[PDB]
Amino acid sequence: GTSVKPIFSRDMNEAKRRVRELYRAWYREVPNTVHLFQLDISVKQGRDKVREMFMKNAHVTDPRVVDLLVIKGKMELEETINVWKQRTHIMRFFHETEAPRPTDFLSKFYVGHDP
Amino acid sequence: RGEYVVAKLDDLVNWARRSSLWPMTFGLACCAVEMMHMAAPRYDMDRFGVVFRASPRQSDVMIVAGTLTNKMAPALRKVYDQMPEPRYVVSMGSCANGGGYYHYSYSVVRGCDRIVPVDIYVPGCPPTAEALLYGILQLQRKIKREKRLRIWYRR
Amino acid sequence: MNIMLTLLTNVTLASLLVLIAFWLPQLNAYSEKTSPYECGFDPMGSARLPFSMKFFLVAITFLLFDLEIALLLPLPWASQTNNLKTMLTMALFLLILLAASLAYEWTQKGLEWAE
Amino acid sequence: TYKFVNMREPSMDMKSVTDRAAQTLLWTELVRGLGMTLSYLFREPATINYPFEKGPLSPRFRGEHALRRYPSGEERCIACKLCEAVCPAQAITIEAEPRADGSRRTTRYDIDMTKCIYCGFCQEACPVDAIVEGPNFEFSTETHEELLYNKEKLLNNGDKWEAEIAANIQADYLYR
Amino acid sequence: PPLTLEAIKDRVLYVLKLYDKIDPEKLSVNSHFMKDLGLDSLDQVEIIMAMEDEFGFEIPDIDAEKLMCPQEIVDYIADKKDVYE
Ligand code: SF4
Ligand code: SF4
Ligand code: SF4
Secondary structure, eight states: OOOOOOSSOSSHHHHHHHHHHHHHHHHHTHHHHHHHTTOSSOHHHHHHHHHHHHHHTTTOOOHHHHHHHHHHHHHHHHHHHTSOSOHHHHTTTSOOSSOOOOOSHHHHHHHOSOO | OHHHHHHHHHHHHHHHHTTOOOOEEEEOSHHHHHHHHTTSTTTOGGGTTOOOOOSTTSOSEEEEESOOBTTTHHHHHHHHHTSOSSOEEEEEHHHHHHOGGGTTSSSBOSSGGGTSOEEEEEOOSSOOHHHHHHHHHHHHHHHHSOOHHHHHHHO | OOHHHHHHHHHHHHHHHHHTTTTTTTOOOOTTTSSOOSTTSOOOSOSOSOOOSHHHHHHHHHHHHHHHHHHTTTHHHHTTSSOHHHHHHHHHHHHHHHHHHHHHHHHSSTTSOOO | OOOOSSOOOOOOSHHHHHHHHHHHHTTHHHHHHHHHHHHHHTSOOOOOOTTTSOOOOOTTOOOSEEEOBOSSOOBSOOOOOHHHHHOTTOOEEEEEOOOSSSOOOEEEEEEETTTOOOOOHHHHHOTTOOEEEOSOOOOOBSSGGGGEEOHHHHHHHHHHTHHHHHHHHHTTTTTO | OOOOHHHHHHHHHHHHHHSTTOOTTTOOTTOOTTTTSOOOTTTHHHHHHHHHHHHTOOOOSTTTTTOOSHHHHHHHHHHHHTOOO
16 A cells, blocks of 8 residues: 555655756746747746745645646646747736635625635 | 718628628538538539638638637637728537537537627528528628718717 | 830829728727737747758759840840851850750759758 | 559550650640530539529428427427437426416426537427427527527417428428 | 856855845855745755856756755855866
8 A cells, every 4th residue: 555656756855856957947937938928927926926836736745746746847838938838828827817716704705605 | 961972982882891701711610511511512602702711811701610619719819800800700500609519518618709709690500501601691781781981970 | 205104104003002002991900900820829939030042042043044044135136147157056055055054953953952 | 352543554665655755745634624624614503592592401401499389279398308308418498387277388498509409309309299490590690699599489480480390290200 | 267266155145135035134154045044945946046147057956955055055166167266
């Protein structure tokens, strides 16, 4: 049960090692993608956003899972730099069209009967 | 008076616009081959005065024909954008009309009108060739009942 | 008197014909409408790159070929000379050298231009 | 069994090569094409004059849906609810209710033309031939709303095309 | 003019406090990232993106896990570039 297959990394140490340089690539690209995709957002909000999706799953301990998001996250940086994706495909991450969802208990209660 | 003169001028523009539109069928699915079927000598759009014209900067009416997916969604809109005015889109088939047979799937936007301002909705799965020919006829009848110059006169 | 007058008339005919084709239709262009059309998808930024050699190679061969044919326009009046034998030999020379230039260009690849 | 499609034996006699040189020099095969299309032009066309004449159809044609009624005139529909259960696109929505007489039919028969796919399964599903789908195909429109047919719209259309579909199922129910 | 060790020091610290979450008062010679400067392991993947544009070079990831303090950066460039004062 505990003994299992190393898809790409034995230990969580080399898991971050795969996260590191991929973040470096996912850090370097921002000025060029923002340039040729012809957006309006600034580079810095692109930079701190890259942090944002690097954050939500920064809580798993299984080495296979984390490096599975490594290849998962490896799979859009080229989908962007070879202009395969669209402007609608990277503004999608910049969730903008929806009104701010409710955070306080009062706001949920006012809106409707749904947790 | 000026109303009569502008009425004739509007009709003069009206007659050509309802007889010289050049459709661009954005071939998507089994609905598209039907539009090529009403290109066959059986129906022959060109006898009405319309020609299948690519380079949608030349076309006037553009026909979505088949299911429309999210992958196809953003490009299809841009085809509508640089399509010069006057521009009209005709919904070919149930899938382009309201998602049709795939209305519940995860990858097709329910109805093409969610992306572009559909002018004529043509039902069918697929709409038989002359049913679309009927829809094109309805387009010219609707084109006949416009008041572009008349509205500007009262503007 | 009439020659440039004929030239003058056509140019005005063309210019007014585009003039009433430009101001009359009540230009109503937008940003997306004026955006370049690339098979309905995003342009990646181009049309500013060299194109190997084949298009250039044929252009120069055409230019060189066009120059030799320039040498042999006056043949219709050349046939009216008093000494045909010299003219017959000389005109034949230009054509066979025109052949030889084509012959070499054919043999050493050449017209089978690069890919 | 099988047969080859491109095993070609070009005979290398002086006769045959003359035709090959004749073929290449004088565009004989290209002229064959010109005379081929010319014969087509000298033929009649087959462009039907729509709408002054329309395509040839069949009694089994599947077109626009229309709920019918008995010779007495009461709606054939009894809300057995078979048609939506087989409807491959779930375009049929319906809720039955008690009626004053007790012949409790449906208060809702809404078929979404932009979801339906015109398989004709509804006809085969209906045990009383209530929902049939008529021969009409001109029911185009300009707004998406008018394609969301409701119980009233089907009933009106059934009363409209009643003259046609009655003979269609009359001449086709033996096949069915 | 060879890039001096002090020049390595001032350049390294310069963009380090140009980074948002480093305070120049807290910045010092012994400005340890996680403990003193209050950074994290992935936070270190910013200032190495920030030191690269100074001298126009590149450094691998096999060392990025040992430069936790500005002197560690300063000495490392000195030996690998082999330029001193
Ligand atoms: S409406 Fe029917 S025929 Fe047309 S594309 Fe959809 S499934 Fe195919
Ligand atoms: S033909 Fe009848 S059963 Fe089939 S999808 Fe349409 S309404 Fe439903
Ligand atoms: S139309 Fe026919 S199949 Fe549909 S609910 Fe009524 S009786 Fe049943």
